[PDB]
Design a protein around this ligand. Sequence first.
Ligand SMILES: Nc1ncnc2c1ncn2[C@@H]1O[C@H](COP(=O)(O)OP(=O)(O)O)[C@@H](O)[C@H]1O
Ligand SMILES: Nc1ncnc2c1ncn2[C@@H]1O[C@H](COP(=O)(O)OP(=O)(O)O)[C@@H](O)[C@H]1O
Ligand SMILES: Nc1ncnc2c1ncn2[C@@H]1O[C@H](COP(=O)(O)OP(=O)(O)O)[C@@H](O)[C@H]1O
Ligand SMILES: Nc1ncnc2c1ncn2[C@@H]1O[C@H](COP(=O)(O)OP(=O)(O)O)[C@@H](O)[C@H]1O
Ligand SMILES: [Mg+2]
Ligand SMILES: [Mg+2]
Ligand SMILES: [Mg+2]
Lengths: 121, 50, 43, 518, 125, 96, 48, 191, 144
Amino acid sequence: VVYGGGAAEVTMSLAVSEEADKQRGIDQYAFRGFAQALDTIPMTLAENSGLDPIGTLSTLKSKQLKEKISNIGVDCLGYGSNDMKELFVVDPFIGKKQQILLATQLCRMILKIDNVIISGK
Amino acid sequence: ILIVTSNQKTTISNDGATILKLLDVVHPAAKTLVDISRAQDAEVGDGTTS
Amino acid sequence: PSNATFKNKEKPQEVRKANIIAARSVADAIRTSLGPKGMDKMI
Amino acid sequence: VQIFGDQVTEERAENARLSAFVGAIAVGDLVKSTLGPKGMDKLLQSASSNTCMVTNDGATILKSIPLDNPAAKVLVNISKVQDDEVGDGTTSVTVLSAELLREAEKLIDQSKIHPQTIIEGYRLASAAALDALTKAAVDNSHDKTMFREDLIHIAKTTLSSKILSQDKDHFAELATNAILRLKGSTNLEHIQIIKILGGKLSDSFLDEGFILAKKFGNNQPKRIENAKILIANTTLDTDKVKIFGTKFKVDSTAKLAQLEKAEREKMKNKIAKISKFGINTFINRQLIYDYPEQLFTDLGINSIEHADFEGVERLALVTGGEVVSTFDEPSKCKLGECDVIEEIMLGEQPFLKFSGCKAGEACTIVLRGATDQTLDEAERSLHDALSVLSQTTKETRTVLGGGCAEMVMSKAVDTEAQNIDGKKSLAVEAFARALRQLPTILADNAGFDSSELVSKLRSSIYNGISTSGLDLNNGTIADMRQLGIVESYKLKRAVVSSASEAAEVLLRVDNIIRARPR
Amino acid sequence: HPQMPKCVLPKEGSDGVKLAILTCPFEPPKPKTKHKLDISSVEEYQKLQTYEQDKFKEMIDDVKKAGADVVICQWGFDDEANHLLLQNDLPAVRWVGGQELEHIAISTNGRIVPRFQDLSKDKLG
Amino acid sequence: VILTGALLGAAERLLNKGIHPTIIADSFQSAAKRSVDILLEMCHKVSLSDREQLVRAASTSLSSKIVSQYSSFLAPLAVDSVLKISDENSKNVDLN
Amino acid sequence: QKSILRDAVNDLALHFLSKLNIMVVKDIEREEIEFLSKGLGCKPIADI
Amino acid sequence: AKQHENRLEDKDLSDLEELEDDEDEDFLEAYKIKRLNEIRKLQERSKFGEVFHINKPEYNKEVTLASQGKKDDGGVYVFVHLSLQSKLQSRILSHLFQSAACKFREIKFVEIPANRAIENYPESNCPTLIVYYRGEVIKNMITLLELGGNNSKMEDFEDFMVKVGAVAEGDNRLIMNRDDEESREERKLHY
Amino acid sequence: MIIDETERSLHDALCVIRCLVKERGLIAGGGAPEIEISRRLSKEARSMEGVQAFIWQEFASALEVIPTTLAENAGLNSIKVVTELRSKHENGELNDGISVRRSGTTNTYEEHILQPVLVSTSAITLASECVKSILRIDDIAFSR
Ligand SMILES: Nc1ncnc2c1ncn2[C@@H]1O[C@H](COP(=O)(O)OP(=O)(O)O)[C@@H](O)[C@H]1O
Ligand SMILES: Nc1ncnc2c1ncn2[C@@H]1O[C@H](COP(=O)(O)OP(=O)(O)O)[C@@H](O)[C@H]1O
Ligand SMILES: Nc1ncnc2c1ncn2[C@@H]1O[C@H](COP(=O)(O)OP(=O)(O)O)[C@@H](O)[C@H]1O
Ligand SMILES: Nc1ncnc2c1ncn2[C@@H]1O[C@H](COP(=O)(O)OP(=O)(O)O)[C@@H](O)[C@H]1O
Ligand SMILES: [Mg+2]
Ligand SMILES: [Mg+2]
Ligand SMILES: [Mg+2]
């Protein structure tokens, strides 16, 4: 299992950013687009919960880069602690994996389309 | 290439074999490219666009 | 948290998005007319 | 860009919301006049076949009226299932659900509180309300005299809003006596509603035994003393033999005449099997042909044909016997007995009246009135009364009515409003004002001042006493135990639970997607 | 039939109610193919009345031999058949969907009989 | 029918006079209930069969139809039709 | 009686009754059997 | 124009022989071979001819599979009858099925009790006549007040079969077109 | 057409006699019982002193339409005829009413204008129940 709720996403994100730095050229900018694309999920949870996305995103990026513990995410119910060990939240690995696989595999098909013919009914 | 026929069913493809099959061609001269594409698809199965 | 201000209004940000896309549509029409490699536009 | 298609209405976060609330206001203002004892009945005119319908029940008003609003369809369905569960109190669900959204409209606009925060206040407020409703109840059924009196008060409280409000002193005896005759069996199919034109509303009389709209045969007598009753789900019709696929091959018509003789001898032996018991009447589910009908003449047996499926169980339970079809073994299947089998006439249609049966587990409510619209109101009125009193047999706990249940529930909600920090405490108070708005509406329909009686009732109950209520006849506060106003515990529990879920569904909305109609 | 008891409990031993599940309903036996039964003079007409009357007697003895307490079929029983079950304190449900019939046997640790001649104690619920 | 419309005409002006409809409705039910008791004192009982009263009552009760002037022989026809069915319990005589 | 399902009379049956000087009628309503039986005092017949 | 078409169109294989001496052989025999082939097709399609008293398990096959027939879209019409012996109209409709079954052998005539057909279907609703064709319900007919009610006749039932497309309008088996021999005899004398 | 009228006409004659055999009461006609109920309730109304009494005055006034309608159909002046109904009823307690043949007021029992009490009872009773149902209506909403 994993621990989602922005945690997973934030983790993934810092990972990608470091790797992006280890990459030079047209590829780095990409990796950066994949990093910022993963950040939209916890920012959406921060937007719906009313918390500031600036303080929320900056705290997760700064904290997760410092500490190696990767189960801290966006607390939407307004608790005082963001550590998800105490909040009783668990998600499966096969479920969170398919979000990235079916998304990145679809968008390859969406980007390849050049000619778009729509026969009016 | 994204094609949508009159029956409103999407069909996305890269090879020219089924793209030309979806577009019902009226002109006989343009049907020559469609016949060789299906013939190349039937015989070999590669190079239908080239 | 629950005490946060919802602000009751999503129509303003949607109208601003409609204006930005409408403004970027015509801005991208004349993007290829800049520099020595620009192209003329006959209207 | 355009994402839905042609002729598709879409709304986003300011047209989506405030379209359901105004729909909740639109559906609530209709049923506002129908609430209470002094409420006015609404008349529904159909669009086709010029069919009119006079009805006071909020569920039936919403059944017939078309409503294309999606938010109003939620109120249409919750009144339907509330009529399915209890049968009474559908108007209170629609009023309380609309006023909860009316208050929440102000909390979203004025106080600027998130919708999810409003629900969290309603969860704690609803829990405190049901806990006060559980503690405010009182046990019953230990003394049959008190259980008899409480059903009379529940029948008076239910029929006070319907057309039987003036004659509820007489109809309360008719309503409560039929329920005690059920012997615990909770089912409404055992009660018949016979429509008779003529007379006045108070002419409805309690029947001893069971009465139905059937008729004797052509040759049968009028009166038989101490008649044994039998019920056949049989086919005394052209029986055929059931191995469908039988045909008759005939070489000569000599044996075909003897074959038809065997068919008449086959049914003769079947009617001879009936006479082994020595019954005095014979009740069949379907039509009886003439040749069986002539055979009951010399044997001294009455005949009743074309009995409904419900009428079989409704007559068998009063008789006490069981439905028999084989007629093979006379040892088992002991039949009942009835003293008076003489029919009577009420109007232009004769009805077979029975009297002096073994058991009265099924009943029949004879009604008299002027217009069929009044009889339809009489049917729906007593159906709500008998439905509430029937479920009171299985669920014993009750609660005081007259608006005291709403205010005593809001007392614990207001008590638990102070110790809750955050912005949801205002939503907890919004739930309290929703409970207060029900007795505010009871005073409006009666034509008296609402702010004074609500203020006097609210200040009186916080002093320490919890038996006060609204007396709309005199227009002042009085003791509900003296007037004898009490309702069931499951009714108000279902109303508060359904109204809490009603506001929860419509408050979790942000967009409306209305596809193209067929 | 609505006169049957609502709640059915077990008696002194064999706490399982022995739920018998059936595919073929309480009906006269006949083949699928089109057929016409040639009925002769009055001797054969009176004989077939005893045939079906002995069939129901053979039917109720077969169920009581198996010792079932609840019987369910996918199709409705005949009328006469609805009363014959009610006499021996043997309730029945009728018209149980075909897709719904298979799920009942799995929970009850039983198996559906194809016909009534193979009915025995081991295959009851 | 005539009377009803008349009482609705009485209730028409009473609605303008600031009286509730339920008070107007209950007043007619109490007034109608008293009206029955007044006629029960005024009505006179008759015998089981009386040609002087029944024939004259049947003729003067039709009073509007085409056969009212033919009632010299049809009013005895109606009395003789019902008198064949007689009972002391005052049953509802069926016209079948 | 009316007897829409099975033929009430035919030319053969009318001929035998014509010699015996017996009148016959058809198209009798099922509801009027009570009136004819109780009026004329004749019980119905449904078997020979 | 119609005078030339009435020689062939308005004469069956038995009536076409009248024009053997008058009309040309090649003109007549060319059409007789055509009409003879049509008669052979009806004989092969005559898979029925008596009322199929069925039961439910079977409905899922007899009523519907048949309606598909060969599935050459060889569709087959299947008239179902939800019988109820207590009703008077049901026994009348059962007689019409056996009468029509002896004539129209290509059309399937199905009968079943209404109590065994649908769970708790109202008894009042039946006698119910359903017409299947290629698995689809062509007509869900209600009680026979439309077809005269208690006074329903064989002529009214045959007219209903023409409306649903089960029998052609100019079919020689229909009583509307099947004029009596005495009727045609008077026409020839008065001609 | 008149044969259909003669059927329902004789149905009224059998039904009127059916009212007499089921209930032995017999009262006069020709505007007799309508004025009696309005006269007897007028004395009882003034002694009550309430808003219910004011409704009973209109109940007594609206009940006088039956002899008023008889005056208009006969062509006589309603006020002159109804004035005679008031002048003769304080002494004549019953059987005083209108006779159409002479076109005036006379003793109806001598002229043999009688009717059952159940007819007038059902008229006053059913009329009050119909007004009870109509006045409770507040809205006219279209439905399916
Ligand atoms: N109580 C909670 N605390 C923290 N995170 C939560 C909580 N509830 C839900 N989440 C997060 O919000 C996400 C919401 O997913 P959900 O909306 O239920 O699935 P879907 O998006 O398919 O409808 C989850 O992946 C989870 O990580
Ligand atoms: N990995 C590669 N590197 C370079 N050239 C390639 C590669 N793969 C394919 N090609 C060339 O590009 C062309 C691709 O043909 P393409 O249109 O992709 O497939 P098809 O011809 O079957 O539709 C071929 O002519 C091939 O010579
Ligand atoms: N006689 C009465 N006196 C005071 N209040 C009453 C009386 N009868 C009913 N009520 C009040 O009317 C409210 C709703 O009554 P109810 O029977 O549910 O009407 P409806 O069936 O139209 O919803 C109850 O909450 C009750 O307190
Ligand atoms: N011969 C008569 N003279 C005076 N008044 C009559 C006579 N016959 C009937 N009436 C009056 O006419 C009124 C209406 O009677 P009628 O028209 O016969 O009622 P319906 O036709 O509805 O039975 C009665 O109230 C009665 O008093
Ligand atoms: Mg390739
Ligand atoms: Mg109520
Ligand atoms: Mg009259």
